[PDB]
Swiss-Prot record:
The chain holds residues 1 to 50 of 300 of the full protein. The gene is SNP1. Present with 736 molecules/cell in log phase SD medium. It comes from the Eukaryota. Component of the spliceosome, where it is associated with snRNP U1. Binds stem loop I of U1 snRNA. Interacts with mRNA. This is U1 small nuclear ribonucleoprotein 70 kDa homolog.
Length: 50
RNA sequence: ACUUUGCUCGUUCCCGUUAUGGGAAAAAUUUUGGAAGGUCUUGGUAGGAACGGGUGGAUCUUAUAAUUUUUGAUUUAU
């Protein structure tokens, strides 16, 4: 926070001092490329006989 | 159901009589509604009503199931 990209003066921009940076935690879900619903939706015609 | 008729019973009063009948009505009792008064409690005490609009904001319907939120690609799959 050496500099100010905001419209306010320096004293006002020191008031908007943020929290410390967020810690890192390993993910528990699926990575974005591996997301899909169900593929291999099986066919509907097998029902129709039996 | 309405109208007339005598008989039997009946809440209360009177009479013919206390077998029973005739007449009157809640005027005695209760429940329901309202007015007034008493007692106890609980809350308020500076705004309120009526009218009004090229007034703000909520909710609802329709555009709107077509890439930026709600009409399915995060049950890890073959």
């Amino acid at each position: 926070m050496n500099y100010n990209l905001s419209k306010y003066p320096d004293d006002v921009s020191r008031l908007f001092k943020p929290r410390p940076p967020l810690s890192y935690k390993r993910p528990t879900d699926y990575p974005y490329a591996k997301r899909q619903t169900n593929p291999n939706i099986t066919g509907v015609a097998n029902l129709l006989s039996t």
